[PDB]
């Protein structure tokens, strides 16, 4: 097995990001077993990405658990090789050995440039990763087997580097979040252990690179009604009164000459009498406040039935004893109380002001840091208001609260105005074998965290894509909202609190289901006791549960009645037996895994029809694809990721290598296949080419620039890199280029792809026009013909599988025993698969 541990330090850059690029940390290996179970103990060190790096124990990609450096999102090093894309590439170092005890690894990642460097025991790793995707956040990660001991050296407070950081590289410990504490946590998980037992957990939540940006609303150009002199002056005066009162309560005083150490107010007059700059600043502040109010849905109103008179302006305690004092108060708070709308308006105005301030900061050049570094232009507070801690939130709110109080007292009648979908829902169900069809049964579920929880009974057939209660296959109950779901929502009972247990009592004998909370029966509007009733048994039901993102809960099937709670409260005297009572071993369940995989097209698909015709006239065997509901009601359009079920494998060594010419027919190693794009289908939304086996992109906003790419650049001792191997997972061209090369044309678009299994190049042609786009691959690689298309017509494409002059068809590459057969013949095994987001695990 392999276990990956991260140092809970996430660094990523973006356009306008506030995080610094260069980061350097260290790791020291202390103890290791040479051969765990006679097999050399695995231990890799490297960096990983937030989105795309989800290792799983057992049944990973390739032959085993991916861990570090087995995907296009994580990059690792194991002392002799660099791991990426499930490919180990040997790298030269002054010290070439597997990580032994008492071995110090140095790791440095500069976000600014796509480069990662490693250094084993002071011997730098000559090779580096380059030109990878920097989107998201990067974090250190170490994978290992049993029998090892390693210690982090993130620097500063946590750990200490055994070698000086490279020039410009800051210690990684400076990127710790202020709200959380540094720790060692897994990447993603679907379960947890606790005192009650196995607590299922939902998908973990993370931030994005675009979340940290400030996006304010400019209000300086807003024009205001003639309130500037009428009542804005009043507002200014009242703000000056409050400010002077606060300074009198503090140690500030009013001396005729301005001094900061002597605590002297520059004006030193009861009335502000501030000169033009000061007066304009203290006026324009309330002016911009009114501008924000009018820019929002708020409308100011100066009419207050001569409230200025009624306002008790005799709030003077004589405490002032300098030139500037006598700052009266109007008892405005007492006169009018802030409504919740006014309070949320204060929050929104403070957020907008801090937002413009943050934008000005980042524009000037400020970049977020754990601490404040004025010379290096770093500020912990420069993050957006929504991203601030509570201290700055309370610091930047009191003045706006007082201003809004003044507004109330002056009677302004202002009134305030897909891919993650399955990555935010985790479903757990029992194994279909456990389904029963007779007898009253019972199970319990404790909602450790209240929210996004649906618990109930579901038939063995459970569509992992659809939620619970949408299809009639489940009598689930969403207690978080207090509504039972079978085909829609239906209010029933009351929502639970934290730590509340829900008892689900199925009655196969009476065909009824009862949902109870903490031993108390939940009631209906009409008073029906059982939550469900009149239930056709059919295949049966299972204790199904659905948890939202990060949601935690304990599913107790009832193996032991001693640990089973509230069974004597409800179920024991009602004739209910706990689920799986006599089983010696715990029940095996099936959860919803969110790994995208290609699956064959269903013949009953609502919108995609797949024809297949072979031996046609002047056309080789071809498989056609056409939309079903186009130009009709109930029609939808969505991205379609398609692939073929059989690949073409390159040779082990890349040793070069009308009427058709026989010797070129017998000596050729290139193969052909064409795509016919039908009229009515916009060519700007079609893609033809190939994908590698390790392709897991289900982007509904797929673009040609969204393709994965990473370069393995191996060097020498002096740094003269000798390698530039470019790796990707898709090689499909866009149709828009060919349609621009040249309304609806009756001639279909013919795109012929050529592949050379011996030289190692993949080429494209379209409508008889050569395509500058070419690709070069490595030996011993298998490529599946794939197509990416947005359906926008009744008939979209047709995949012909044929041959050209002096060019064999793909069947000779497809079949070893049929390598010398020039006749094209689509294999019976061959089929078209489309990408599905969720599977069962």
């Amino acid at each position, epitope marked *: 097995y392999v276990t990956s541990i991260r140092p809970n330090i996430f660094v990523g850059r973006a356009e306008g990001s506030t995080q610094y690029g260069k980061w350097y940390f260290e790791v020291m290996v202390d103890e290791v077993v040479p051969f765990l179970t006679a097999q050399a103990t695995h231990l890799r060190v490297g960096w990983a990405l937030t989105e795309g790096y989800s290792p799983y124990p057992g049944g990973g990609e390739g032959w085993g658990g991916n861990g570090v450096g087995d995907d296009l999102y994580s990059y690792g090093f194991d002392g002799l090789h660099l791991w990426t894309g499930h490919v180990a590439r040997p790298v030269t170092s002054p010290g070439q050995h597997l990580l032994a005890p008492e071995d110090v690894v140095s790791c440095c990642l500069d976000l600014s440039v796509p480069s990662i460097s490693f250094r084993i025991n002071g011997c730098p790793v000559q090779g580096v990763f380059e030109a990878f995707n920097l989107d998201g956040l990067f974090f250190p990660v170490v994978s290992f087997s049993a029998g090892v001991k390693v210690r982090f050296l993130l620097g500063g407070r946590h750990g200490e580097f055994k070698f000086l950081p490279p020039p410009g590289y800051a210690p990684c410990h400076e990127a710790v979040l202020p709200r959380e504490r540094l720790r060692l946590e897994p990447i993603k998980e679907y379960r947890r252990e606790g005192p009650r037992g196995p607590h299922l957990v939902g998908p973990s939540r993370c931030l994005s690179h675009t979340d940290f940006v400030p996006c304010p609303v400019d209000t300086v150009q807003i024009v205001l009604p003639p309130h500037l002199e009428r009542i804005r002056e009043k507002l200014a005066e009242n*703000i000056h009164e409050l400010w002077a009162l606060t300074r009198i309560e503090q140690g500030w005083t009013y001396g005729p000459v*301005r001094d900061d150490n002597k605590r002297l*107010h*520059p004006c030193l007059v009861n009335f502000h009498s501030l000169p033009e700059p*000061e007066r304009n*600043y203290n006026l324009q502040m309330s002016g911009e406040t009114l501008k924000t109010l009018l820019a929002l849905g708020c409308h100011v109103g100066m009419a207050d039935e001569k409230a200025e008179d009624n306002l008790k302006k005799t709030k003077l305690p004589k405490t002032y004893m300098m030139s500037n004092g006598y700052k009266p108060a109007p008892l405005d708070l007492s006169h009018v109380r802030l409504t919740p709308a006014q309070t949320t308006l204060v929050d929104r105005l403070a957020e907008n002001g801090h937002n413009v301030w943050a934008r000005d900061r980042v524009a*000037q050049g400020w970049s977020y840091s754990a601490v404040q570094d004025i*010379p290096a*232009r770093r500020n912990p507070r420069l993050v957006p208001y929504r991203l601030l801690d509570e201290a700055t939130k309370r*610091s930047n709110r009191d003045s706006l609260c007082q201003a809004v109080r003044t507004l109330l007292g002056y009677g302004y009648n202002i009134e305030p105005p897909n891919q993650s979908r399955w990555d935010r829902v985790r479903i757990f169900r029992a194994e279909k074998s456990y389904t029963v069809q007779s007898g009253r049964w019972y199970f319990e579920f404790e909602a450790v965290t209240t929210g996004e929880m649906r618990v109930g009974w579901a038939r063995p057939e459970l569509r992992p894509d659809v939620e619970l209660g949408a299809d009639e296959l489940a009598y689930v109950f969403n207690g978080h909202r207090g509504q039972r779901w079978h085909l829609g929502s239906e209010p029933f009972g009351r929502p639970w609190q934290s730590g509340d247990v829900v008892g689900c009592m199925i009655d196969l004998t009476e065909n009824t289901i009862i949902f109870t909370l903490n031993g108390e029966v939940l009631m209906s509007d009409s008073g029906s006791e059982t939550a469900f009733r009149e239930i056709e048994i059919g295949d049966g039901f299972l204790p199904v549960c659905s948890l939202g993102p990060g949601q935690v809960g304990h599913l107790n099937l009832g193996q032991d009645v001693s640990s089973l709670r509230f069974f004597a409260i409800c179920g024991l005297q009602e004739g209910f037996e706990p689920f799986a009572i006599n089983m010696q071993r715990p029940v095996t369940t099936w959860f919803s895994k969110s790994l995208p995989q290609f699956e064959p097209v269903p013949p009953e698909h609502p919108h995609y029809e797949v024809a297949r015709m072979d031996g046609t006239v002047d056309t080789p065997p071809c498989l056609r694809l056409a939309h079903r509901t186009w130009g009709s009601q109930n029609s939808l359009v969505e991205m379609l990721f398609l692939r073929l079920s059989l690949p073409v494998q390159f040779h082990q060594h890349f040793r070069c290598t009308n009427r058709d010419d026989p010797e070129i027919i017998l000596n050729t190693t290139t193969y052909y296949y064409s795509v016919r794009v039908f009229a009515g289908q916009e060519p700007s939304c079609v893609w033809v080419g190939w994908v590698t086996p390790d392709y897991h992109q289900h982007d509904m906003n797929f673009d040609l620039s969204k393709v994965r790419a990473v370069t393995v650049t191996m060097g020498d001792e002096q740094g003269n890199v000798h390698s530039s191997l470019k790796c990707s997972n898709c090689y499909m061209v866009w149709g828009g280029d060919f349609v621009s090369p040249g309304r609806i044309s009756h001639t279909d678009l013919v795109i012929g792809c050529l592949v050379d299994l011996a030289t190692g190049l993949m080429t494209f042609t379209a409508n008889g026009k050569e395509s500058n786009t070419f690709f070069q691959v490595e030996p011993n690689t298998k490529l599946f013909p794939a197509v990416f298309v947005l359906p926008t017509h009744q008939n979209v494409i047709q995949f012909e599988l044929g041959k050209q002059k002096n060019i064999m068809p793909l069947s000779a590459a497809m079949f070893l025993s049929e390598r010398k057969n020039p006749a094209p013949q689509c294999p019976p095994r061959l089929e078209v698969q489309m990408l599905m987001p969720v599977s069962w695990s």
Partner: nanobody
Amino acid sequence: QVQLQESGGGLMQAGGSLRLSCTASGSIFSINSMGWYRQAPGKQRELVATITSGNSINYADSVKGRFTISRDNAKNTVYLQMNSLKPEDTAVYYCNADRVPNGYNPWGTPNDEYDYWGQGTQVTVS
């Protein structure tokens, strides 16, 4: 964003006049305050005499000698002249411009953070 190009203070002996012309090129907005700071090599950075809008002058301990600052917000031009010299005056001067009004900020840390640093100039005394 204000760029404060400061040039002046060439090496000289004790009693030699050193002029320092600084230019705070940028928006003519929020030009009400102008400060100066000397970071002595490996030593604390002390506040030199600052002048706020309205020909207002604020002095400190580091103004000892003959500091004659003639900065004007009209054209963002600083003219810190130092006729006298002492051997402890060897410091990297800096030209910081800010929006703070009369050295007081009723609003708080937001506007306070509104500072624009400048390259500054090594001043050396033999």
